[PDB]
């Protein structure tokens, strides 16, 4: 069964690494596995082929390359299927073998198999999509000799710019009950140009397009391996206007939950995936105009996020079914069901932008551009520390790069937000205040998930705690080098408690108190916990409608499970809560 399988294959991998030689001579049973592959899950199949491949492609034993042939046979047979079930399996096997034989007949075999795979993949859309995807995965993971890559990438860019790139005509030909427009361009790129992309004429012609995002990913990665990080012939794609219908929130286009509601929700979903891909692409690049274009795309993305969760609240039934192809597609073959699962999941370097300092338009990078980055990091780190590209990365390096890009960079954002809400309470337009409130809610949510990380239970990460909580103590005063654990806790919590003048809502209030709790568990000190949870229970928390939807039930249940427990006299604290519960 499942775990058995999993573990076992882990072990086999360990064993081949331990000693390829002896394994070589028991290889025959390993080949003999291949008649039983009905019961395996594709993740397990991936490692299995990894095994058999690394087995076969030991140069010292090519005489018994019989297994190479057997593998090519089964590749062929499972490929040759109308049924996706076997086709995907073959695909996977093929690509893995390719990456593994990747350390000139080597290159001839490589390109032969590759073009074979491409031909097998092409006509089925999800197949070719997966093919690009896993090819991109292989290429980022392996530094292989760039001969088939310089061979393929000059054809991929041409096929891309003839399949999708179209002259910037506003309305193309075709019968549309939807006003087609070159919309959501960043408008620094001149609209009357060549580079613009065809979406709605393609999706209506369906009743190529779905794979657009991973195809661009492969294009990005092949050009990033050739030019070594340069995106010089692609800057037009960062800022071109997109051939979209009116993406105004269609409340007038209601009582219309027919196939056209599916067209609009899927269209918004696909362009969202497209912009998610664009922000994954242009994150690592340092050019400041391209960064500001990425800022404009981040706000475009959160705009289309609110538009799409509206368009799915319109009808809750019309699933636009497109999950990521690693784990999700096999389970098949409300806004939160698609937010993480359906949509394309983003890259860890995307948070190179939130380094920039907050600006305020209520009081006087954008606040909503930072809201989207922090909301991305929140869902990302709750997914990881509790996603294809990110799962290959261990959670330790994730929390590591978080300690650098968030904690010394978003301290200035938290301080500017303290100054924002202090001025807002002094005054006490509203959308700027609430976007800042939700930006702050996501900041403290990220901090809570950061310092609720169970890796700090292990002893090697206490040096990262002595760095992180010391840079938190640094916010009150610097120079307290090589402090005790409990003193650094006291300094970090004395720094974070002072924001209890600024916290506008209650979801941010509970993330701040539980953040104080998880940093304080490292340590008498129960008085600070009880008094500070009581301070947060006793503060106003101004009552916006969504601001009090942030006073959800299980949230207060968690806050009071903390306060009534850690308060020293639990029963006298219960007597106080009862005394104050009568005059309500």
């Amino acid at each position: 069964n499942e775990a058995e399988v999993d573990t076992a294959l882990d072990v086999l991998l360990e064993l081949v690494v331990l000693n390829p030689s002896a394994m070589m001579m028991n290889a025959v049973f390993v080949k003999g596995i291949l008649d039983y592959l009905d019961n395996i899950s594709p993740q397990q199949i991936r490692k299995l082929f990894y095994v058999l491949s690394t087995l076969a492609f030991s140069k010292q034993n090519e005489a018994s390359s019989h297994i190479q042939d057997d593998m090519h046979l089964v590749i062929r047979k499972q490929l040759s299927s109308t049924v996706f079930k076997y086709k995907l399996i073959g695909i996977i096997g093929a690509v893995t073998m390719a990456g593994i034989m990747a350390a000139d007949e080597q290159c001839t075999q490589v390109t032969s198999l590759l073009q074979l795979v491409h031909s097998c993949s092409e006509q089925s859309p999800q197949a070719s999509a997966l093919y690009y995807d896993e090819f991109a995965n292989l290429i980022q993971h392996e530094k292989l000799d760039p001969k088939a890559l310089e061979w393929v990438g000059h054809t991929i860019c041409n096929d891309f710019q003839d399949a999708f790139v179209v002259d910037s005509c506003v309305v193309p030909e075709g019968d549309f009950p939807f006003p087609v427009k070159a919309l959501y361009g960043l408008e620094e790129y001149d609209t009357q140009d060549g580079i613009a992309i065809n979406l709605l004429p393609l999706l209506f012609s369906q009743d190529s397009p779905l794979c657009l995002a991973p195809y661009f990913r492969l294009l990005r990665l092949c050009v990033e391996r050739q030019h070594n990080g340069n995106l010089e012939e692609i800057d037009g794609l960062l800022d071109c206007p997109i051939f979209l219908t009116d993406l105004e929130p269609g409340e007038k286009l209601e009582s219309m939950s027919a196939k056209e509601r599916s067209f609009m929700c899927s269209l918004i979903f696909l362009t969202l995936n497209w912009f998610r891909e664009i922000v994954n692409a242009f994150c690592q690049e340092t050019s400041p105009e391209m960064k500001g274009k990425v800022l404009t795309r981040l706000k475009h993305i959160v705009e289309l996020q609110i538009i799409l969760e509206k368009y799915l609240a319109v009808t809750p039934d019309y699933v636009p079914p497109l999950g990521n192809f690693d784990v999700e597609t096999l389970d098949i073959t409300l806004l939160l069901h698609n937010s993480h699962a359906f949509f394309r999941e983003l890259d860890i370097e995307v948070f190179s932008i939130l380094h920039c300092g907050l600006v305020t338009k209520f009081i006087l990078l954008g606040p909503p551009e930072l809201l989207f980055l922090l909301e991305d990091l929140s869902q990302k780190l709750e997914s990881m520390l509790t996603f294809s590209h990110l799962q290959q990365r261990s959670a330790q390096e994730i929390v590591h790069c978080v300690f650098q890009l968030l904690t010394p960079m978003c301290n200035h954002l938290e301080n500017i937000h303290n100054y924002f809400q202090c001025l807002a309470a002094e005054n006490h337009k509203v959308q700027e205040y609430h976007i800042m409130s939700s930006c702050y809610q996501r900041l403290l949510q990220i901090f809570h998930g950061l310092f609720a990380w169970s890796g700090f239970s292990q002893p090697e990460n206490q040096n990262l705690l002595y760095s992180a909580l010391h840079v938190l103590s640094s916010r009150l005063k610097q120079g307290e080098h090589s402090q005790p654990l409990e003193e650094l806790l006291s300094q970090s919590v004395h720094y974070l408690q002072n924001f209890h003048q600024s916290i506008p809502s209650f979801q941010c209030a509970l993330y701040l108190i539980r953040l104080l709790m998880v940093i304080l568990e490292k340590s008498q000190n129960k008085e600070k916990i009880a008094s500070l949870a009581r301070q947060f229970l006793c503060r106003v928390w101004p009552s916006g409608d969504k601001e009090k939807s942030n006073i959800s039930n299980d949230q207060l249940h968690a806050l009071l499970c903390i306060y009534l427990e850690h308060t020293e006299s639990i029963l006298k604290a219960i007597e106080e809560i009862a005394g104050v519960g009568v005059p309500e």
Binding site: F29, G32, D35, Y36, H72, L73, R76, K77, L79, S80, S81, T82, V83, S112, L116, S119, C120
Partner: protein
């Protein structure tokens, strides 16, 4: 002659390639023969050009494809090419085998049927494509009438099973049924034909044959494989004892049979149960004539598995 077709295919489909395809109507045979003689990559390029320029929405390309299919079928076995070209051809054909109607693939099935029956198939590698064709037939809902594609598949496979096989080519025959989606009686007739084929075999050939018979038995068809092997080796050892009234070779066989039956019941915790149920003399207590030296040897080589051990050792005792 090729580079023109390359240039026609370089840009677009079914607008100039079709037009040129309606120029050169015959001589594809000799064309492909000099092609494989000089360089097989050109044959693959021609095949790609042909299948893009001969879509099967239009029915003229369907016949070009049927002709070139028969051409490759005959040459790949007879005309001894290089290995990589042969693999490539087979892969290409298995790729484009899906774009056909029912009856064209039915007549390709009848081609292979008559060929393996009588045609001295030089290498038999062409059979790799056959189960792809059976798959396309089963799945294609373009209904026939002679009736569904899956039922015409049943007919063709019943034809093949009731028909005679080659001595050399039973390995590959059953290797094809390996990956097919089959039902009870499908797999039953497959194994029954391969079973009755045992009486015309060298003995070094039986081990991998039974290996494949069993990995196919895995589908549903467990009991009859073992029952037949039992009766076979029972009569064999009786005949050998009457001769005594190649002993070392005969032993060497029986051993590796039992080894492979062990791996089988190792992977299937039910196989041994039916094995037991087939064998248990104590249905009421009267002696069955099912057991044998080889039977018992199999049981004792089995008892070293952790589950059946005590069960078997009680059975034998009683």
């Amino acid at each position: 002659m090729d580079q023109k077709i390359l240039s026609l295919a370089a840009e677009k489909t079914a607008d100039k390639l079709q037009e040129f395809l309606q120029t050169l109507r015959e001589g594809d045979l000799t064309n492909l023969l000099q092609n494989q003689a000089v360089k097989g990559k050109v044959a693959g390029a021609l095949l790609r050009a042909i299948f893009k320029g001969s879509p099967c929405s239009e029915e003229a390309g369907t016949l070009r494809r049927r002709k070139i299919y028969t051409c490759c079928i005959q040459l790949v076995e007879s005309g001894d090419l290089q290995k990589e070209i042969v693999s490539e051809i087979i892969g290409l054909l298995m790729l484009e085998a899906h774009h056909f109607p029912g009856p064209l693939l039915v007549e390709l099935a009848n081609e292979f049927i008559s060929a393996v029956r009588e045609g001295s198939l030089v290498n038999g590698k062409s059979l790799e494509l056959l189960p792809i064709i059976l798959t396309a037939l089963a799945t294609k809902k373009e209904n026939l009438a002679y009736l569904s594609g899956e039922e015409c598949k049943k007919q063709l496979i019943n034809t093949l099973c009731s028909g005679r096989w080659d001595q050399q080519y039973v390995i590959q025959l059953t290797s094809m049924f390996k990956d097919v989606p089959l039902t009870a009686e499908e797999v039953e007739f497959v194994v029954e034909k391969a079973l009755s084929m045992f009486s015309k075999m060298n003995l070094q050939e039986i081990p991998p044959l039974v290996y494949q018979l069993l990995v196919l038995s895995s589908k549903g068809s467990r009991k009859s494989v073992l029952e037949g092997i039992i009766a076979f080796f029972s009569a064999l050892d009786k005949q050998h004892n009457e001769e005594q009234s190649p002993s070392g070779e005969l032993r060497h066989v029986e051993g590796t049979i039992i080894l492979h039956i062990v791996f089988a019941i190792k992977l299937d915790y039910e196989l041994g149960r039916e094995l037991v149920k087939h064998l248990k003399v104590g249905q009421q207590g009267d002696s069955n004539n099912n057991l044998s030296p080889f039977s018992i040897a199999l049981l004792l080589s089995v008892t070293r598995i952790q589950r059946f051990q005590d069960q078997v050792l009680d059975l034998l005792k009683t």
